[PDB]
User: Fold Fumarate hydratase class II from Mycobacterium tuberculosis.
Amino acid sequence: SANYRIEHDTMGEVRVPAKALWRAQTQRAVENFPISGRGLERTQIRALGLLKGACAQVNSDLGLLAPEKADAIIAAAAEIADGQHDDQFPIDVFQTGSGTSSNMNTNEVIASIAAKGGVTLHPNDDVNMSQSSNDTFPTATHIAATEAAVAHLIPALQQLHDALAAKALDWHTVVKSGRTHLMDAVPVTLGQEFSGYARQIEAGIERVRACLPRLGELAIGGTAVGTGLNAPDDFGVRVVAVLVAQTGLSELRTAANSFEAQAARDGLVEASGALRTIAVSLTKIANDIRWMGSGPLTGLAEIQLPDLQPGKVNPVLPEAVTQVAAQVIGNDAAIAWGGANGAFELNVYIPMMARNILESFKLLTNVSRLFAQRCIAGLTANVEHLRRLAESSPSIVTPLNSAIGYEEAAAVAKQALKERKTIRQTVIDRGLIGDLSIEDLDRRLDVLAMAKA
Amino acid sequence: SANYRIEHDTMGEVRVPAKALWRAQTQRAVENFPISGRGLERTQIRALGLLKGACAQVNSDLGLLAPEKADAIIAAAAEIADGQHDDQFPIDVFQTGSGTSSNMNTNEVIASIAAKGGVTLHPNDDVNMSQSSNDTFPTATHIAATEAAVAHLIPALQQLHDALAAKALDWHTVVKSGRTHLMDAVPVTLGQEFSGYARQIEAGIERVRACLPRLGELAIGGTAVGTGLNAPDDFGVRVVAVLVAQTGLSELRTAANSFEAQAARDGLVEASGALRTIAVSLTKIANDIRWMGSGPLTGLAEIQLPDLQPGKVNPVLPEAVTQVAAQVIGNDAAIAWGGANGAFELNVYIPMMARNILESFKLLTNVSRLFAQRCIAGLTANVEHLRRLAESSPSIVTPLNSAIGYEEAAAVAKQALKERKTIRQTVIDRGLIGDLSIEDLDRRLDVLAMAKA
Amino acid sequence: ANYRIEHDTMGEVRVPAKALWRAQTQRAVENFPISGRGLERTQIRALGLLKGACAQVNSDLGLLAPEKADAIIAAAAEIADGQHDDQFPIDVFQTGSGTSSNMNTNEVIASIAAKGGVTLHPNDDVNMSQSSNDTFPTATHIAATEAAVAHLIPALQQLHDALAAKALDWHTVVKSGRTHLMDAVPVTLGQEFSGYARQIEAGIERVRACLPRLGELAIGGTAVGTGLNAPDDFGVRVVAVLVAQTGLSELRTAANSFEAQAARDGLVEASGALRTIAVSLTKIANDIRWMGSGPLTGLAEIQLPDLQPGKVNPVLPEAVTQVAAQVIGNDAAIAWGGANGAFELNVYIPMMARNILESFKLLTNVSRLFAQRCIAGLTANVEHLRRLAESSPSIVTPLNSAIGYEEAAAVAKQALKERKTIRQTVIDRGLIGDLSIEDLDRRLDVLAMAKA
Amino acid sequence: ANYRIEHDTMGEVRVPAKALWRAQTQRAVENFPISGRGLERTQIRALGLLKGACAQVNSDLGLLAPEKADAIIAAAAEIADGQHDDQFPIDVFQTGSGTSSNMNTNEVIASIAAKGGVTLHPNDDVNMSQSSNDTFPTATHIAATEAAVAHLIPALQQLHDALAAKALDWHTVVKSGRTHLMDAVPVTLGQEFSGYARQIEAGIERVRACLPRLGELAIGGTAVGTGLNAPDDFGVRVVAVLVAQTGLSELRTAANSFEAQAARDGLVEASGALRTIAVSLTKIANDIRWMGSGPLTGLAEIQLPDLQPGKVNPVLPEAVTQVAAQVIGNDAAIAWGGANGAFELNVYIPMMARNILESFKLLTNVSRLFAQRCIAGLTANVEHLRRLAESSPSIVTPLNSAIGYEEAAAVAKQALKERKTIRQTVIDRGLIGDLSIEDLDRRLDVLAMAKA
Assistant:
């Protein structure tokens, strides 16, 4: 069987692939949890890298760890954090609830990498010095989630907002009939509707920023149960300082309360709530847009979606956005479930929670840029059609009530539909105008003024 | 005979109950939606009252409505807002999506009340002047939700926080074994665990405050599609100014964007997210507490819950808290579903969304006070028992690894565990003391210092 | 009479004068002021049925004096007949086992028996052979089973019939199909409605598929499931009486008496079926409000009847989808409580009961409303529908075998620009003669393309 | 070469040299860089089965040349045999109908046939008689049905057997029951496990109950469900071939071809069953980790094995409950998508497929693991459990009729203060005699109280 170096944990024998930098513990964990076949996300591996490096830096600063060992860890951690080893983390997402396995995985890989550079490290004694698994994995998760929100999800939303706001301006005077309960209503502009979508996204950004104060709080330094036992007293504070300086994420901070920070994962539940709300907003926007398109003769035909690769263009991007929204809502239900079921000094749903929140960040980041660039940007409005429908709608007969009778007017509406003409063109055909000048029919039937832009 | 009145409209005879202040439209709506048998919540009726009164005030200020009619509306609306007519709103929660029926219900009742005071009002022309149903009902909902959050839920949480923080102080030095994965771990204090619960509640308060900027935004002044057609151009701003002054809720404000504010209900979805996160925290707290009191001989027996009737007490209040949390999570799923399915200028899930968010506010407010006063406040700790378990735990023979041989320390842990005595006393039964002095012992086996209180 | 005093032997209590409940209930009222909502009528009725059956069986086994049994039986019967829905004030959010509501039922039965000159001990007589832990869950499954068999299924059947009738009336009403919301090949309005009809029929099938477990009862377990302090066949006798009295053949003792108290999986399972029906109804109600949707700027395929009997709001479809949203949320609360039992007792029963019974009720009622006041009165805009189908680019492909892909594509471009039928566009380009007109009509037959 | 340049109708693209997919797939790869996760293996296999069956039938009806049919069949067979799981790069989040993945399958079959010297038109030949709208949903229900019958059910059966075995081995292992988490009357560990066992058995029954609808297939319905441009009996023939090749008698044509494409209710229904099983497992895994829970400060009723040959972390219970959480979330996403189809097509299929198939997989795998590496190796602390049962105040009431209530209460209080057994504390208060030690050891028989 293919190249399989042998290794000995006190328990016994074990065969790891030859190109593998992980070691026995990881290989066991691989045999123990063949459940989903999916391992850690890249963003998560990077965060473990950042964290291990910072810890070695601080351990060295406090003179607890020899500088040679520290430097080898730091350089190893840096490759991992730079995404050079995403293929060295084979452990299933569904593992020990504290994330111990993945933590040991990181330690083993760092020692293997340091060894190929002629330095010997003890996975636990050196790489895991001053740390518990119980404070390490949750800290990596909140680092990944915080980076995903600040460096990815927010800029992506900002780009979607800009693209919607641009349409709100270009279409400022594109008048159309409003719809409520799906029925004809008074006039709006396409530009007003898009400023509505634009605000929704802007509010999404505000709600993501509102959760950062708690999403960026870190458990590091709390160790086994939160008492910091066997860590130097200011380990957390120092580690976070190093992480902020290296990543530029001012949002990371030690936890207000070190017990709440390990016994619970409320910050992830809170952030998931914001992601879900954005999914709700996007569902609305994407649904309006595919309806506005929807195809040409038997639908609304208000706008034309660009083709993904340039006439009945399928609303492919709106289908992606709503599918993604559904996934975010599902993930969000799994996160709350795990959030609620901690016991005493440790919540043991972290690997499952991390997987769902990080996927939610990723999906929303990516579909938002796609939606902005390959759909919203290239939309075209059927200006004449929209305006002709607005000017032919019975909803706009009401000003006529001072100029003609309530029954005289309702008849205008009643024929305009029957004979299918504009209201103006109809008030001209029952002979009405004057005694109500033509010049003052135009005034009370000004659909753009009714939209009160 | 006596007690039913007969009423009429264009279709025929409605036949309402004699004491009813509602009229035909309301009675039809009653016949059209016999679905749940449950009508508007009190807090929602009050808000409709506040809103109608403020509208009449402003209509009068702008000289659009005769001061005599305005004053009769204002006084009628004030009785409604003061809860004197909660029995005059029979319409099912499941009705027209915009809340038109309940809006008409409010108008009819105000006109009936004004009439009994010798003033005639047209339900629509006077009471509904400058308003659409589409901006009125959602505005009432966000007024009710904002009041529930600021006047009731936050003070309730503050009370629950105080009671947990008090226990955190009283129990500062009550040392016990920590648990992770439900297994024995290093020492914590009961006080530390409670400071953790305390911070969860404090974070709950912070997350409710973080949503107010959007929960308090109001649609009033939009009318039918968000344009303000057939209303004074500054109606919204005036109405909100009156509501703020009357209620003292500085958090109320006109919407940033009047289209987003009617086409969507994202602020309710966002608020529900925070309520759900609080349900998640409470579930954890209530679970830890019922496990700690768990029944005396076959459970953990760490604390004793007070009886609701001032030796086995059922943890009744924790069962209420977790049942409530389950309901908040369900309600929050219905809110998101409705939030996502608006169309164009109007979201038509408002009555259903209002019912669920308002109930969620109410349940969390009430169970939080109950939990604080009738459970948390009266807890007692089994101090001796807790301390004896901590001093008998394998976890603590590691300070020994230096003063005695590893295979002797692990032996201390396995010797004590069997004879079931403290770890200090199994050092004595081996005689290790001397050659190991005493005070060095009580030094290394100091469980309270290990909790690092 | 403002308030009477009651004894607790652990304190004194003031209960309203017209109240048939006693001290324990009044305490429970002071201890759980949480939601302000008590037991549902269907749930009160079930507690009534159960207490009566228990007294009948206790008497049969000669454990309870026939005079006391008869007083309980008659009291229980008034409660089960809905005469005392106002005597159950205890909040839904209470002790997780439902002990409070169980005591409430006992107290009221004793008060009622007392007004007829018979003395009963709420616990010793009315609760004989029973625990709270097996009693409340049994009442819940009786209520849920009755709600499914006597109410929801008949309601669904009625909605099905009304959709099947439209499927027949509209068999030949041809229209353009839509996929991804874009024009597609022809369907009939009748075919779409047979599709809605089958969804409801499948809903009925999935409700019947859960009855074998929804109707399983815990009665006879007592406190932890062992049957301690009950006669070995108490459960079997009680269920036999309930089946005979109610006519619900679906009720049965539980396969395993421990699973039947330690868990509420039957409720979680039934909720799944209700939620699936909510999913189906959302689809149906959405298609229908879109098909309405208002007259000039929408699809205008059909006209909804007005409830106030040209612009009628889709009011009933808005009710159906709001209800569907509530069923989905209730279903999430039920699963949460279902999952969190511990050892011999699940303590989320009152919360689970409230949500599943409401879900039954809402779906029962909105289904009858939808059927009678919306589906039954719909009218189809037949000419309009057919003209749009005959004018669609999607029906030019059968022209391919007779003219090019290219002439077929120019025909499609021209019909849209000139707003004509495809058939008239073919005649206007002078393509007939050389394909004949009978061939053109064979090929452009939209009703045959739908496959009648 | 590094990048073969394939050409496309609207331009050109660079596909990896070792790629069997073609232009359309590569475009779809550039258009949906969303999740970075493609089709599941079980789903790729099902597309293979389906394409093969279709070619077989097209040939049977003499619509497709036997040489082309044979090359498709052999290509499809490699794909169905899992030899090309690396040729399906398209994101799960794509066109709602699954068109992209359907084209992906067609291109790969043509590339494979070409390497064997036969030319196939991806659309004209491999997609003959098929629409994307009936193909992808059919593949999904084939995958879900196979996952339920060949994998999940056998896994659950294994977990049931392992729990039933403990129910027998531990038949007389008496212990204190818990309700509310408080001491209660005696049960045996074997009774509790028969309860877990029945929950899993019920899980199996609820999966079987959904197969009649989970196994229904859309194939033959084409674009909108009318079957336009497919042979009248295409569906029926394709399903017959699939049943014969796979041995899955559960597969069947849909009852109504419109409902079968306009909706995905069968997936929503199946997800309901999977969710119920997640609820049951959460309960079972929770009881078990509490029964472990660690040795001195916990319950210490049983000892969990360590994973490979009393301080053992409950690692497998943590995996089960994490999985349960994921199934509950996936189940929420499935319902959301289920509800939001429009007219003749539900466009949430790729998302729904991904969630239901993962739910099957996770439950299958963690169920075997739980059974073999946890349940099988559990040991009960028999003496400890029995001593606690014999020392419980819950068991003094069978004494009420020899000593009274008050004495039975002093025995109970003193038993607790001095940590003695009840038996020993009755003797110590000199109650015996005039109560024989024989009357005493009959009334205090905890195993008889469990009524085992």
